[PDB]
């Protein structure tokens, strides 16, 4: 049934997933259905969502402190969106919009940070194990004439 | 400061490595030429089955526990060549892509989890009363608070 909690939850997840994906990626979930019904809903989501880019009440409500563990932010802000006991479709879509901004925010720190720590380990190993050898070769320009395949 | 100066070598290594990782994640003059040879050797390594096995036999999902051991292992015979130097950059890059392909979907799924959880607690009832999701097609307002 269209009003059964099972269809509402199933559809809501499909809609949320597709909405986050468009605004940002293999989630290994159920794939978003391409039938007409779902398509109509996804397009309605996009139109209301796009309009929320210039909704500054929402931008204010959603603006977070640098580090505060996304979990803290999320529940407080979401309750805040609904704390007067009112509901409408706009606030529901605002909830999806907020989740999407929170993904973006987390990724813009977690990803560079991840790249940095791994590059840190690598350049550190290079400095301590490989540097003298590279010096003895005359620097990095030796790379230009390497055509071998390494074995171990 | 000098092509053989450790300053210049580390500065160049940092740029090459960063650019290398950027290309793999996507899919000056002296430096661009280096970047190109590095891309070539990195591309050749994709079908270096010995390297490929070596990486396969390792738990790439726990990069912290594994990196220095494998790196040390690659040079454990005291020998050096440019291919092995590139293989280290290649390995690093693998760890990065492996982390991205796991942590990014996990991060997104966790946040979707909180959202759907909230929607179920707080909004499920209201949505039911709207007759379900199709109500969305009859909404042309904007929310205020
Ligand atoms: Pr060290
Ligand atoms: Pr709960």
Curated annotation (Swiss-Prot), chain A:
Keyword annotations: Acetylation, Apoptosis, Cytoplasm, Host-virus interaction, Isopeptide bond, Membrane, Mitochondrion, Mitochondrion outer membrane, Nucleus, Transmembrane, Transmembrane helix, Tumor suppressor, Ubl conjugation
Motif extent (BH3): 41-55
BH1, short sequence motif: residues: 80-100
Chain span(s) of sequence motif BH2: 132-147
GO BP annotations, alphabetical order: apoptotic mitochondrial changes; apoptotic process; apoptotic process involved in blood vessel morphogenesis; apoptotic process involved in embryonic digit morphogenesis; apoptotic process involved in mammary gland involution; apoptotic signaling pathway; B cell apoptotic process; B cell homeostasis
Cross-link (Glycyl lysine isopeptide (Lys-Gly) (interchain with G-Cter in ubiquitin)): 110
UniProt PTM: Ubiquitinated in the absence of XRCC6/Ku70. Ubiquitination promotes protein degradation.
GO MF annotation terms: BH3 domain binding; channel activity; Hsp70 protein binding; identical protein binding; lipid binding; protein heterodimerization activity; protein homodimerization activity
Tissue occurrence: Expressed in a wide variety of tissues. Isoform Psi is found in glial tumors. Isoform Alpha is expressed in spleen, breast, ovary, testis, colon and brain, and at low levels in skin and lung. Isoform Sigma is expressed in spleen, breast, ovary, testis, lung, colon, brain and at low levels in skin.
A cellular component annotation (GO) from this entry: pore complex
Mutation effect (residue 56 to D/E): Strongly reduced interaction with MCL1, BCL2, BCL2L1 and BCL2L2. No effect on cytochrome c release and subsequent apoptosis triggered by etoposide
Keyword Acetylation: yes
Protein task: Plays a role in the mitochondrial apoptotic process. Under normal conditions, BAX is largely cytosolic via constant retrotranslocation from mitochondria to the cytosol mediated by BCL2L1/Bcl-xL, which avoids accumulation of toxic BAX levels at the mitochondrial outer membrane (MOM). Under stress conditions, undergoes a conformation change that causes translocation to the mitochondrion membrane, leading to the release of cytochrome c that then triggers apoptosis. Promotes activation of CASP3, and thereby apoptosis.
Assembly information from the UniProt record: Homodimer. Forms higher oligomers under stress conditions. Forms heterooligomers with BAK. Interacts with BCL2L11. Interaction with BCL2L11 promotes BAX oligomerization and association with mitochondrial membranes, with subsequent release of cytochrome c. Forms heterodimers with BCL2, BCL2L1 isoform Bcl-X(L), BCL2L2, MCL1 and A1. Interacts with SH3GLB1. Interacts with humanin; forms fibers with humanin which results in BAX conformational changes and sequestering of BAX into the fibers, preventing BAX activation. Interacts with SFN and YWHAZ; the interaction occurs in the cytoplasm.
Domain commentary: Intact BH3 motif is required by BIK, BID, BAK, BAD and BAX for their pro-apoptotic activity and for their interaction with anti-apoptotic members of the Bcl-2 family.
Protein name as catalogued: Apoptosis regulator BAX
Species this protein is from: Homo sapiens (Human)
